[PDB]
Amino acid sequence: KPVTKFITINLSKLTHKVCYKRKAPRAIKEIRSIAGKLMHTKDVRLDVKLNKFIWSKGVRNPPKRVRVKLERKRNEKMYTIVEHVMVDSYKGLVNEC
Amino acid sequence: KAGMTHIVREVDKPGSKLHKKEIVEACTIIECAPMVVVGIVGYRETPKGLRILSTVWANHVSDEFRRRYYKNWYKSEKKAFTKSLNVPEATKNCLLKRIEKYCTVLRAICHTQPSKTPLRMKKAHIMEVQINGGSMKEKLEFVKEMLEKNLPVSTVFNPNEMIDVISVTKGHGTKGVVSRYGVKRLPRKTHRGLRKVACIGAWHPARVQFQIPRHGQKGYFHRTERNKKIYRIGLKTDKNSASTDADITEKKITPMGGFPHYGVVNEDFLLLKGCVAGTKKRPITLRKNIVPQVSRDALAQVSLKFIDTSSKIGHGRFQTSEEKVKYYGPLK
Amino acid sequence: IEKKRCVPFRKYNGGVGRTNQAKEFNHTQGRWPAKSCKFLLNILDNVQANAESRNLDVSKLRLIHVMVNKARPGRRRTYKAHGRINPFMSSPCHIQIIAREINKISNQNRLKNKSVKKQQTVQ
RNA sequence: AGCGUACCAACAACCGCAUCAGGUCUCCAAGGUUAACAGCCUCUGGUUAAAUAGAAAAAAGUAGGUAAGGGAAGUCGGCAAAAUAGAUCCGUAACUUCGGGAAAAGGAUUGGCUCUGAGGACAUUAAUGUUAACUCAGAACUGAAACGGACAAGGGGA
RNA sequence: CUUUUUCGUGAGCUGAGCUGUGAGCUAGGCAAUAGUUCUUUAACAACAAAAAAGAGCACAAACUGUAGACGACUUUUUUGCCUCAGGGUGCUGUAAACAUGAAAGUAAACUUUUACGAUCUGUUGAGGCUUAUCCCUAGUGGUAAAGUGU
Ligand SMILES: [Mg+2]
Ligand SMILES: [Mg+2]
Ligand SMILES: [Mg+2]
Ligand SMILES: [Mg+2]
Ligand SMILES: [Mg+2]
């Protein structure tokens, strides 16, 4: 059944091993995989503004942390939408339903 | 195995250049929680080698001893050791009488307690410990008094004793001849590359011999090393387990910030002079010498003057966390 | 196709790798050839459709015959060093399937006398 | 009057057996830094494609980078690599066909910021006004003593 | 096969003792035949169909990195683990913003007032970062699919 979640992901933990030309696509792939595994949905869609945010500093160094919102809809009966949340500080944020 | 540190000691060697001076030495720390004795096994001699008569178990065993018999305990009904411990004592005494009558070697089965360490594993380790001493009757009366108790480490070894160590070296995978065997590296002009052996053999034994070094797997080997000396046996009930008579700061053995890649040591432990094969967390087997040493080093007794407990992350500068706050004063 | 189970390669296995999923078949080498699986699935669907017409119950069908034959190959080229040209062939095949429905002294008077005497002697 | 006029011109339309990293003649030519149509970055116009993609990442290879103390002991042999490089101001031997050698060899300086001085034209009277354009000298402050900061760019001698 | 009788030997019977089992003692009555030999079908161990007496785990999956080319190996699956956060321990070297604070000097209104100014100082041992193979924490939110063999 439908549900909504707010989580933060730190990407430097996930892009630590790849080379310069692969740092941003690796982050994108990791975000998709994480969301799909946390929602039990094979169909995962990424909003274009989030993709724009991930690439804002070039291919070589994406941001170290990102806050996203995950919602599961009813449409392979279900699927997940992933959006971007703008924050000015990550200090206190834990994850919530 | 937990990690390493260094100490300060005064030398007592008449004739040496270091006869009356303070020196620094490296040491290794082994976490040594007590084991539990759970069974008995007896052997007799034959022309085909030693031979088992039978095995006798204690009346109750723990769940971390039973986990070692399963590839996946979380999905099982856990019926191991649930019928056999319910036998009358009469059968056990008849078996023990037979072992007293026909056997010549006794060994005791013991297991470790990984829940008292910071390890992720929950299965215990099982091993057999031979019991030397008097006659077989005395050996049997000795073992039975221990059949469901704890062995602390100071029941087995003594301070200033010499010990042997058995473990498995660190793994590295597939390595070349230059690293695996240490052969002379070949000139820069070589066409197909320079990290190899130039000649594999003469023409005519028309085969390669088994003494020629090749590429292959390096590390994760089994080793036995002699003559490692004991410097101190710590106790988990002791507040100043890393302080000396010359340094009365009240200290434990664990450095500021935890042993890197291991965790905090809060059981009793051993301090060994030197180094030991294996990674952090690697299980280390300890044994007495084949025959006792009587040399001057094995008999000399050691008095320590300083154990170091500064951080091994980065370049540590304080011995305790209170010094650090006292030095800087109030922060923002 | 989804790499949940494998196909053990027992005959044409020169250089094929080793895998974790082959232990199910008591073997060490396996692979996941998807194209072959799709081609076989089309034919099995045809077999089931032809069994629907002649009124057989599908739950009892057993594949009693599976035969694969190699057909005439197609032709292309590849180019090599020092001005040479070499073949670049293909390898097509045939397939056929059948499913089927499953459930679940001489008298010789002299010889007769010998037999009688033998049987008498053992009692 | 008659004949030609589409399209490619290599990036897959030409020659090389091919949709081959090769070969193949002319014209136009922006901004910044500079001696510079060099090197590096950019606007107009063009493109984001190459006989494949994903994951893992050890031996060994190929194209690169760094290395304490020593400094050719290596090798047939300093092969390969390293060191030097732009401008300005000083100083330059033997020998010589008197022209050279010569950038011989050697030495010092170089950023930023705030100032001072020197180089023209025009029109009313030695005075008065109106106006440029890039160069070259000197001084005080300033910084983890750095400044041809990337690019570009001689090793020398008997 | 009958008759007259003895001794050992044990099931039910407690070296009472019937009887089971073997070995004998008297006196008798009653068989064998396939036409001259063709291996004298004779042992040991199995199996099948009937009748009676007895009746669990491993692989896979998601984690782990003490392991690693791939296989293989070390681990966990609800006091565990993954995640993010707080705390510790370290690395770098004092953030952005304001200040009618400083600054070699400069020009422009009538002792001050306005303007420009490399750089410096105060708030500031500050700000950032720290496991992906660092340490601690019944802190937050999760912990999915039902497949294969025996
Ligand atoms: Mg060569
Ligand atoms: Mg260290
Ligand atoms: Mg503290
Ligand atoms: Mg070719
Ligand atoms: Mg050719």
Ligand SMILES: [Mg+2]
């Ligand atoms: Mg006959």
Ligand SMILES: [Mg+2]
């Ligand atoms: Mg035309």
Ligand SMILES: [Mg+2]
């Ligand atoms: Mg035209």
Ligand SMILES: [Mg+2]
């Ligand atoms: Mg031709």
Ligand SMILES: [Mg+2]
């Ligand atoms: Mg071409």
Ligand SMILES: [Mg+2]
């Ligand atoms: Mg091409």
Ligand SMILES: [Mg+2]
């Ligand atoms: Mg390489």
Ligand SMILES: [Mg+2]
């Ligand atoms: Mg360096």
Ligand SMILES: [Mg+2]
């Ligand atoms: Mg060096």
Ligand SMILES: [Mg+2]
């Ligand atoms: Mg030499």
Ligand SMILES: [Mg+2]
């Ligand atoms: Mg030599």
Ligand SMILES: [Mg+2]
């Ligand atoms: Mg050279």
Ligand SMILES: [Mg+2]
């Ligand atoms: Mg000269």
Ligand SMILES: [Mg+2]
């Ligand atoms: Mg500031």
Ligand SMILES: [Mg+2]
């Ligand atoms: Mg982790």
